[PDB]
C-alpha cells in the first residue's frame, strides 16, 4: 500500500543541492560518480533495496510483516514464529558500546593528495607523489558526551583521518587544539573520569563546568594550558569546517638514508577559522544538537567539500633540546613564529557515507596504525595511546577481527599467520598459519625494510636510563605556554576566555575549587585572573597580586597564529543566510539577494511565520524552508530582510527576536527598505551602525557591504553594545 | 595528599537539604539511615574509600598514579608496567551497549506498601497485607535519544518500578501516556526504527520532529492516539515527579480462589500532573540537558520524595467485549469515567543510588517478570514484549547471569540447576544440576500453586483458532481515542498540541508526508487539522473538510482525567522561585520572601549578575547561588524581584530578558517596591494584570497571592499576550 508520491518528490535528485533543498540521503545515492578507491571497495556489502522482496536474514520472503503469528486472530503468540524472533531478536541486538571517549562524532569520505613529493625527509609511500591520491575517511567528534549528545557543547574536537595508503593504514588521530590536558597515559583515566559525568548521578553531560573537572585542573596545573585553549572561542567551532586540527605529538619522519626528522601534524582548514559564541553555542545544543553533523553532511551534498590543509614542523633531529620546552611534551606547543608549517598536501572530503552506525559508528582509529617512513617519540602520552586504541577496540566491535568490518579494511593487501577470533570473515587457504613453515615455502614473508615497499624497521633511538616511574623535570613548568596563548589573543577572545573561565567556575558549587583556579590563573597573568576573579565575587590577595607572570616562550612575548581572528581568514563560501519573509516580498529585492549570495557560494533559507508558500509581488511562489521559531538564528551567519508588506511581520514576536539573538551574536543583519523599520528591536543607531546593512533596496552595494561584513565572521566592534540588549 | 580544605567544605552534610546548597553525593552517605531490605542487601558489594591505600584490582599497593613506567624519565614507556596497563584496560572497558530503547533514564530506591489486602481479588504477596513493605528501584525515562541525549525533549516517558517481593522480582514496565503507538510487538523495530535517528546521518536526536517518523505515522493510523498524546504538553513534563504513569496493557489479576480479574496499572503523581511548555522545553535541553535527573536527585536529597499512588483499573471476566474497543488492544484507553482507578498503595522514592553505572545503568527490567497472582492476556504488542526483553539483556548486560548484578537480585530466595554462563558469581554446591534427582532428594523442588507462597501456574485461558498472522478486526479503530483525548484538553491544551504538530510537521522536509498527517487529523476532529493546516500553508479539500468525526467512546464525549490542567491538582512542594539580587536589597522583603517559601516547601535560588555576596541594606550577607545567565528562567516556577537598589540591575539585559524568558513561558512573576519598575519591560500596565504579583513591598498577600499563582503551575491567560513579545 503505502507508496511514494506519484511526483516523485519522496526522493532526493542525484546531484549537488543547497542545504534544506532536498531531502538528504546515503552518499551512494546522492552521488553515485563521486568515486575513490575506499569507496569503490565498500561495494562487496553495500545492499540495495528498490524492487527486491522483503526476506527474513536467511533469505525466506515474508508474506505478512504486520503481524505475529497467533492462534485465533485475538489470541496468544506462538513460539514458532521464527520471523517475528529474528526480527525481534536483530532489533534487540542493534547496540554495541560507544566509544568511551569522542562517543559523539561525524564522518565523511574524501582523498588526499601530497603537493610534492616528500621523499627527502620520508619514505612514506602516501607522501611520495604529487599525482598519487589516498582515499581518507575522518571522523570528527567531541570529547566527553555520550554518542547522543550535542554538538555545539565546550569541548575539545577530536579530528581523526584514516588514509588507506598502499603500505598500510596510517591513522593521524589528533584534536582541534595544539595539546592535550595532561603528560603521561597513566592519568589518562583521572582527567577522563574528572570532565565525564560525575558517578554517583551522572551529571553533566557534554560540559567541564562542574566541580570534578575544576578540582583536577586546580590540582594538576600541567592541564591549564588546555584549559585556557578550551575556554576561549576554540572550544565551541562554528563548524568542523572551521577548526584547526593537530596530531599533538612529536612524531618522526624516515626517509630512505635511515635519518630522522621530528614532526608534528597540522591541517589548516581551508574554508577558515571561525567559532560561536557562548550563548549561541549553548542554546544551540538545545535547538539543533546535531548542527555540526548536520552542516558537514549538508555542506558536502552542496559541493561545499570541507578541505583541510596537511602542514608539518619540522625539527631537526639535532635541535631536540634548543626550545625552553621539552618537544616530547603533549602539553607544549610549538610557535609558529619559531617553526613554521610547511605545507604538505590537501584533503577534500567529498562523500557522505551510506549507513551511519556501519562505516561511523564502527570505524576504529589508532594513533599506532603508521606505515613506513614514519615512527614514534618518547611522548609519554602517545606512548601509553598505543597500547589503548588495539585494547578498547576488542570489546567495543567484540573482538580481534575488526580490520574485517568494511570502513576499516586496508585497500592494500595483507597477509598473515593470525587466524579464528570472534567473526572472522577471511577464510584463509595457507596450509600454514605459523613461520618459519616449509609447507608453504614460508609465505606469506617478511620484507627487509628499504626505501620503498619495504617491511617497518622502528628508528634505533638510543635508549639510556633506569626504570622509573617518573615525570621527566623538564616537562615540569606549566604557565608560560598559557601566558603565550592570553597574551596572542585580541581583546575580544580574551573577553571570551574570561567568560568562559567565570561561566564555568560559577557552576563550580565547592568555592574553594574556584578560588584555587583563580589561584591557578595569577601564575598565567593577573589581568585575566583579576577579571575571573570579579566575575565570582573573588578578591585577589597580596601575594597573589604578586606572582612573578612565567617567562616567554623562547623570546616570544605572542603569536598571532595561535588567535582565531587576528589574521583575517574569512571565506564566505559553504555559510548561510536566514531571509526573512513576508506576505508580498519584493522581487527584485529577492532577485539581486540570491544573485549576489550565489556569486559567493553563500546559502540561503527562506522564514516565514508559518510554513507552505507565499507569493512576492511578481507572483514568483516562494516555497518555505522553516519558521522564524523553528530555525532560529542561530543556525545561520546573518540575516537579511528585504522589502515587501513589512507590516505582515513588523509586529510578530518571533520576527522580532530573530534579529535580537543575531544581533546578540554578533552577526550581520542587512535591512532593506521599509525592513529598516525593525533597527527599533534591536534598540540602537539612527543614522547607522557597523554591522547593520541599510539601504532604500537590496542592491550590489547592499550585498557588497553584506558579504564583506560575512567575511569578517561576526561584528566584534558591536560587543560593548550587547549586553543591555535583553535577548 | 591531603587535599580537602582544612573547614570541611568539601563534604555535604548527611541531612536534607535543599537544592543546591550542598555538592550532591552518593546515596549511601547522604543519607546513610535511609534504610530498606534492598538498600541492605546491596552492603556487601558498597565499597568505601577513606583512609584506604590505592591499589591495583588484585590489591597491589600503589606508589606512583601519577607515571608509566620507562626507561629514563624521558624514555620509552615499558610493556612491563602492569600497573599502567590494567589500569587502563579498564578504562578502556568502561561501556557496554546502552538499552536499545529509552537509553536515557534517571532512577532511585524508594518503597511501597499496599493501602489494604487485596486478598480477595489477587494471591500476589506483595499486595496481601498493608503492613508488608515492598522495597523498589524505579527508573524514569525518555525513548528515542541515547544514554547522553538531553531530559525535556518532546517525547514519551518510561516509568519502570521493580518491586522486590518475598515471592519474586515484579517488574511494572509502564511509560507515562496509557496507550502505545502501535498495536503488535512485530512492527516494534519498524516503529522505533522511524522515530530514531535516520539511517544515512544518525539525526535527529531525541526528537520525533523529522520525515521518517510522520511517514510512519502518515502510514499507520493505529499511532494517533499515542502521537496525541505526545503533541500534547504530556510529551514535556515539569518532572518525573509531576507526570501520571501507566502500565498501559491489560494483564489479569489472580485470586486464590483461582478467579482472574482484568487490570491496567495506573501512577497518580502525588505532586500532581505538571508540564513545560516546548519553547521552554527546547531550551531547556540546550541551557540544561540534564534537567530532569537533577531534579528527581535534588528532590530526594532535598526530602522532597517523589510520592506516586498506585491504583488499579479492574474489570470482571465477563465484561471483556462491553466496551466499544477491544480491552487487549493497546492503542486503546480505558475512561475513567466508565472504568475508575481503585486506589491501591503509595510508593516514596526516598534514597539516590551510590553509583549511577551500577545501579542504574545495569538495571534491567522486565514486564514478564510476574508473581503468582498476576498473569498475562493476549493483547499482541504484551506477547512480544515478553520476548524481548529476556533477549536484549543476554547482550546488553554480557550474559545470562545478569540476575546477579547487585541491583537485580531478588531479596527472596532463588534456587534452581541453572549453571554457568558468564560472569557466574553463585556457587553452587547442589551435587545434582538436573531433576528429577535422587542425588540430592529432588531438591530444589517444585511447589504446588495455593494461596500464599505456592508455584506459579498459568491462568487456564481458553485458546480457540488457527494459527493466523492476523490482526483483530477489533483493534482495527483509530480515531475516536485520539478525538475522546481531544475534546478533554482545554483550549489552551488545544493550542499546545496543534502546536506541537505543528511544529513537528515543519521539520519534516517532504511536503506530501505533511499533508497526509493533516489529511489523517482531518479524520479526527476538523478544528484540529484546519488549525495544522494553517500552520503549514495546508488547505483543507472539500471532501477533508466533510469527513464525519469518529464515534464517541462508549457515549464520551470527554473525560477530564485525560486532560494535565482541566481538573487542579497543583502541589507546590518541591518548586523553586528564582529571586533577582541587587546590590542593596531591602532585608524585610526578602525575610518574608523566604520564610514564606520555606513555610511550603518552595525551594530558592538567589541570583545576580556575579557570583560571591551581595549586603542587603541592613548588612546581611546575601551568598549567590548563579548568575542570571547561569541559572535560567527555564529552571524556575516562578520570579521574585525584590525592592532595593533596582537601578543596580534595571539596565542590565540578562535580568530583564530573565523576566522576558519567564514571562513568555506563563510563570508567575512578582516585583515588589521599585521592581515594578520591571513593568515596562514586560510590557505590564499600570493597572496590573492576573499573574503578576506587585505591591509596595513583599508584606502582607504579596507572598500567598505568588503561592497561589504557583499552585496553579502557569497563567493560561496570559497566553494571547505572549503571542507578540520578542522573546
Ligand atoms: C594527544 C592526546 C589525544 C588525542 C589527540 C586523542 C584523540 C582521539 C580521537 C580523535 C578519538 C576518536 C577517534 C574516532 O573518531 O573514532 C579518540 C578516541 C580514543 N582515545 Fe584518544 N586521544 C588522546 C589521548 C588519549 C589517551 C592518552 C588515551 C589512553 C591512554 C586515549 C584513549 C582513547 C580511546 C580508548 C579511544 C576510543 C577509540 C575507539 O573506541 O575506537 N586517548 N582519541
Ligand atoms: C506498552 C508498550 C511498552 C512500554 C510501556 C514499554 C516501556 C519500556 C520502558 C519503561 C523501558 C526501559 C526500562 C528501563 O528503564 O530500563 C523499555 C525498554 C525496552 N523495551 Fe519496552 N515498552 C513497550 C513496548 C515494547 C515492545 C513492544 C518491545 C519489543 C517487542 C519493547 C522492547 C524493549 C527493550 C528491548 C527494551 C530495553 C531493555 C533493556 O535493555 O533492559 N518494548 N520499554
Given at each position: 500500500?503505502?507508496?511514494?508520491?506519484?511526483?516523485?518528490?519522496?526522493?532526493?535528485?542525484?546531484?549537488?543541492?543547497?542545504?534544506?533543498?532536498?531531502?538528504?540521503?546515503?552518499?551512494?545515492?546522492?552521488?553515485?560518480?563521486?568515486?575513490?578507491?575506499?569507496?569503490?571497495?565498500?561495494?562487496?556489502?553495500?545492499?540495495?533495496?528498490?524492487?527486491?522482496?522483503?526476506?527474513?536474514?536467511?533469505?525466506?520472503?515474508?508474506?505478512?510483516?504486520?503481524?505475529?503469528?497467533?492462534?485465533?486472530?485475538?489470541?496468544?503468540?506462538?513460539?514458532?514464529?521464527?520471523?517475528?524472533?529474528?526480527?525481534?531478536?536483530?532489533?534487540?541486538?542493534?547496540?554495541?558500546?560507544?566509544r568511551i571517549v569522542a562517543?559523539?562524532?561525524?564522518?565523511?569520505?574524501?582523498?588526499?593528495?601530497?603537493?610534492?613529493?616528500?621523499?627527502?625527509?620520508?619514505?612514506?609511500?602516501?607522501?611520495?607523489?604529487?599525482?598519487?591520491?589516498?582515499?581518507?575517511?575522518?571522523?570528527?567528534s567531541?570529547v566527553?558526551?555520550?554518542?547522543?549528545?550535542?554538538?555545539?557543547?565546550?569541548?575539545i574536537?577530536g579530528f581523526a583521518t584514516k588514509?588507506?595508503?598502499?603500505?598500510?593504514i596510517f591513522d593521524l588521530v589528533g584534536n582541534?587544539?595544539?595539546i592535550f590536558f595532561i603528560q603521561d597515559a597513566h592519568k589518562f583515566p583521572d582527567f577522563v573520569?574528572?570532565?565525564?559525568?560525575?558517578?554517583?548521578?551522572?551529571?553533566?553531560?557534554?560540559?567541564?563546568?562542574?566541580?570534578?573537572?575544576?578540582?583536577?585542573?586546580?590540582?594538576?596545573?600541567?592541564?591549564?594550558?588546555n584549559?585556557?585553549?578550551?575556554?576561549?572561542?576554540?572550544?565551541?567551532?562554528?563548524?568542523?569546517?572551521?577548526?584547526?586540527?593537530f596530531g599533538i605529538h612529536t612524531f618522526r619522519?624516515?626517509?630512505?638514508?635511515?635519518?630522522?626528522?621530528?614532526?608534528r601534524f597540522?591541517?589548516?582548514?581551508?574554508?577558515?577559522?571561525?567559532?560561536?559564541?557562548?550563548?549561541?553555542?549553548?542554546?544551540?545544543?538545545?535547538?539543533?544538537?546535531?548542527?555540526?553533523?548536520?552542516?558537514?553532511?549538508?555542506?558536502?551534498?552542496?559541493?561545499?567539500?570541507?578541505?583541510?590543509?596537511?602542514?608539518?614542523?619540522?625539527?631537526?633531529?639535532?635541535?631536540?633540546?634548543?626550545?625552553?620546552?621539552?618537544?616530547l611534551d603533549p602539553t607544549?606547543?610549538?610557535?609558529?613564529?619559531?617553526?613554521?608549517?610547511?605545507?604538505?598536501?590537501?584533503?577534500?572530503?567529498?562523500?557522505?557515507?551510506?549507513?551511519?552506525?556501519?562505516?561511523?559508528?564502527?570505524?576504529a582509529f589508532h594513533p599506532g596504525h603508521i606505515?613506513?617512513?614514519l615512527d614514534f617519540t618518547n611522548d609519554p602520552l602517545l606512548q601509553g595511546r598505543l597500547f589503548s586504541y588495539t585494547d578498547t577496540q576488542i570489546?567495543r566491535?567484540?573482538?580481534?577481527?575488526?580490520?574485517?568490518?568494511?570502513?576499516?579494511?586496508?585497500?592494500?593487501?595483507?597477509?598473515?599467520?593470525?587466524?579464528?577470533?570472534?567473526?572472522?570473515?577471511?577464510?584463509?587457504?595457507?596450509?600454514?598459519?605459523?613461520?618459519?613453515?616449509?609447507?608453504?615455502?614460508?609465505?606469506?614473508?617478511?620484507?627487509?625494510?628499504?626505501?620503498?615497499?619495504?617491511?617497518?624497521?622502528?628508528?634505533?633511538?638510543?635508549?639510556?636510563?633506569?626504570?622509573?616511574?617518573?615525570?621527566?623535570?623538564?616537562?615540569?613548568?606549566?604557565?608560560?605556554?598559557?601566558?603565550?596563548?592570553?597574551?596572542?589573543?585580541?581583546?575580544?577572545?580574551?573577553?571570551?576566555?574570561?567568560?568562559?573561565?567565570?561561566?564555568?567556575?560559577?557552576?563550580?558549587?565547592?568555592?574553594?575549587?574556584?578560588?584555587?583556579?583563580?589561584?591557578?590563573?595569577?601564575?598565567?597573568?593577573?589581568?585575566?585572573?583579576?577579571?575571573?576573579?570579579?566575575?565570582?565575587?573573588?578578591?585577589?590577595?597580596?601575594?597573589?597580586?604578586?606572582?612573578?607572570?612565567?617567562?616567554?616562550?623562547?623570546?616570544?612575548?605572542?603569536?598571532?597564529?595561535?588567535?582565531?581572528?587576528?589574521?583575517?581568514?574569512?571565506?564566505?563560501?559553504?555559510?548561510?543566510?536566514?531571509?526573512?519573509?513576508?506576505?508580498?516580498?519584493?522581487?527584485?529585492?529577492?532577485?539581486?539577494?540570491?544573485?549576489?549570495?550565489?556569486?559567493?557560494?553563500?546559502?540561503?533559507?527562506?522564514?516565514?511565520?508559518?510554513?507552505?508558500?507565499?507569493?512576492?509581488?511578481?507572483?514568483?511562489?516562494?516555497?518555505?524552508?522553516?519558521?522564524?521559531?523553528?530555525?532560529?538564528?542561530?543556525?545561520?551567519?546573518?540575516?537579511?530582510?528585504?522589502?515587501?508588506?513589512?507590516?505582515?511581520?513588523?509586529?510578530?514576536?518571533?520576527?522580532?527576536?530573530?534579529?535580537?539573538?543575531?544581533?546578540?551574536?554578533?552577526?550581520?543583519?542587512?535591512?532593506?527598505?521599509?525592513?529598516?523599520?525593525?533597527?527599533?528591536?534591536?534598540?540602537?543607531?539612527?543614522?547607522?551602525?557597523?554591522?547593520?546593512?541599510?539601504?532604500?533596496?537590496?542592491?550590489?552595494?547592499?550585498?557588497?557591504?553584506?558579504?564583506?561584513?560575512?567575511?569578517?565572521?561576526?561584528?566584534?566592534?558591536?560587543?560593548?553594545?550587547?549586553?543591555?540588549?535583553?535577548?
Amino acid at each position: 500500500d503505502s507508496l511514494a508520491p506519484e511526483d516523485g518528490s519522496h526522493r532526493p535528485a542525484a546531484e549537488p543541492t543547497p542545504p534544506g533543498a532536498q531531502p538528504t540521503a546515503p552518499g551512494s545515492l546522492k552521488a553515485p560518480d563521486t568515486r575513490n578507491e575506499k569507496l569503490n571497495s565498500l561495494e562487496d556489502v553495500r545492499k540495495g533495496s528498490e524492487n527486491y522482496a522483503l526476506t527474513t536474514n536467511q533469505g525466506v520472503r515474508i508474506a505478512d510483516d504486520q503481524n505475529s503469528l497467533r492462534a485465533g486472530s485475538r489470541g496468544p503468540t506462538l513460539l514458532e514464529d521464527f520471523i517475528l524472533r529474528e526480527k525481534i531478536t536483530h532489533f534487540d541486538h542493534e547496540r554495541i558500546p560507544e566509544r568511551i571517549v569522542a562517543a559523539r562524532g561525524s564522518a565523511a569520505h574524501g582523498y588526499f593528495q601530497p603537493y610534492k613529493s616528500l621523499s627527502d625527509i620520508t619514505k612514506a609511500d602516501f607522501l611520495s607523489d604529487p599525482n598519487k591520491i589516498t582515499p581518507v575517511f575522518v571522523r570528527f567528534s567531541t570529547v566527553q558526551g555520550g554518542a547522543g549528545s550535542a554538538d555545539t557543547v565546550r569541548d575539545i574536537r577530536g579530528f581523526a583521518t584514516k588514509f588507506y595508503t598502499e603500505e598500510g593504514i596510517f591513522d593521524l588521530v589528533g584534536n582541534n587544539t595544539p595539546i592535550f590536558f595532561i603528560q603521561d597515559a597513566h592519568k589518562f583515566p583521572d582527567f577522563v573520569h574528572a570532565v565525564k559525568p560525575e558517578p554517583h548521578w551522572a551529571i553533566p553531560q557534554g560540559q567541564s563546568a562542574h566541580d570534578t573537572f575544576w578540582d583536577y585542573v586546580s590540582l594538576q596545573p600541567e592541564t591549564l594550558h588546555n584549559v585556557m585553549w578550551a575556554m576561549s572561542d576554540r572550544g565551541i567551532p562554528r563548524s568542523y569546517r572551521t577548526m584547526e586540527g593537530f596530531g599533538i605529538h612529536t612524531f618522526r619522519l624516515i626517509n630512505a638514508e635511515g635519518k630522522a626528522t621530528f614532526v608534528r601534524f597540522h591541517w589548516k582548514p581551508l574554508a577558515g577559522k571561525a567559532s560561536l559564541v557562548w550563548d549561541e553555542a549553548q542554546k544551540l545544543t538545545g535547538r539543533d544538537p546535531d548542527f555540526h553533523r548536520r552542516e558537514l553532511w549538508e555542506a558536502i551534498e552542496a559541493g561545499d567539500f570541507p578541505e583541510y590543509e596537511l602542514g608539518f614542523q619540522l625539527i631537526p633531529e639535532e635541535d631536540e633540546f634548543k626550545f625552553d620546552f621539552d618537544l616530547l611534551d603533549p602539553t607544549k606547543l610549538i610557535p609558529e613564529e619559531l617553526v613554521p608549517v610547511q605545507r604538505v598536501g590537501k584533503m577534500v572530503l567529498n562523500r557522505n557515507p551510506d549507513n551511519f552506525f556501519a562505516e561511523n559508528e564502527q570505524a576504529a582509529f589508532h594513533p599506532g596504525h603508521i606505515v613506513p617512513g614514519l615512527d614514534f617519540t618518547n611522548d609519554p602520552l602517545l606512548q601509553g595511546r598505543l597500547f589503548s586504541y588495539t585494547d578498547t577496540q576488542i570489546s567495543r566491535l567484540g573482538g580481534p577481527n575488526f580490520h574485517e568490518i568494511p570502513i576499516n579494511r586496508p585497500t592494500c593487501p595483507y597477509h598473515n599467520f593470525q587466524r579464528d577470533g570472534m567473526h572472522r570473515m577471511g577464510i584463509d587457504t595457507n596450509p600454514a598459519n605459523y613461520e618459519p613453515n616449509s609447507i608453504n615455502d614460508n609465505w606469506p614473508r617478511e620484507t627487509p625494510p628499504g626505501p620503498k615497499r619495504g617491511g617497518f624497521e622502528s628508528y634505533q633511538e638510543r635508549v639510556e636510563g633506569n626504570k622509573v616511574r617518573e615525570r621527566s623535570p623538564s616537562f615540569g613548568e606549566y604557565y608560560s605556554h598559557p601566558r603565550l596563548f592570553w597574551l596572542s589573543q585580541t581583546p575580544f577572545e580574551q573577553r571570551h576566555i574570561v567568560d568562559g573561565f567565570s561561566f564555568e567556575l560559577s557552576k563550580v558549587v565547592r568555592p574553594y575549587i574556584r578560588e584555587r583556579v583563580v589561584d591557578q590563573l595569577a601564575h598565567i597573568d593577573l589581568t585575566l585572573a583579576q577579571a575571573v576573579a570579579k566575575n565570582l565575587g573573588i578578591e585577589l590577595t597580596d601575594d597573589q597580586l604578586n606572582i612573578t607572570p612565567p617567562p616567554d616562550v623562547n623570546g616570544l612575548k605572542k603569536d598571532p597564529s595561535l588567535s582565531l581572528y587576528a589574521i583575517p581568514d574569512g571565506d564566505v563560501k559553504g555559510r548561510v543566510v536566514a531571509i526573512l519573509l513576508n506576505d508580498e516580498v519584493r522581487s527584485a529585492d529577492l532577485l539581486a539577494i540570491l544573485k549576489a549570495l550565489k556569486a559567493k557560494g553563500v546559502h540561503a533559507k527562506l522564514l516565514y511565520s508559518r510554513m507552505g508558500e507565499v507569493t512576492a509581488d511578481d507572483g514568483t511562489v516562494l516555497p518555505i524552508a522553516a519558521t522564524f521559531a523553528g530555525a532560529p538564528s542561530l543556525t545561520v551567519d546573518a540575516v537579511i530582510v528585504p522589502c515587501g508588506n513589512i507590516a505582515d511581520i513588523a509586529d510578530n514576536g518571533d520576527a522580532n527576536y530573530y534579529l535580537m539573538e543575531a544581533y546578540k551574536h554578533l552577526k550581520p543583519i542587512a535591512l532593506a527598505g521599509d525592513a529598516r523599520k525593525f533597527k527599533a528591536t534591536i534598540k540602537i543607531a539612527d543614522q547607522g551602525e557597523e554591522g547593520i546593512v541599510e539601504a532604500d533596496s537590496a542592491d550590489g552595494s547592499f550585498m557588497d557591504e553584506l558579504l564583506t561584513l560575512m567575511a569578517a565572521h561576526r561584528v566584534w566592534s558591536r560587543i560593548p553594545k550587547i549586553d543591555k540588549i535583553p535577548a
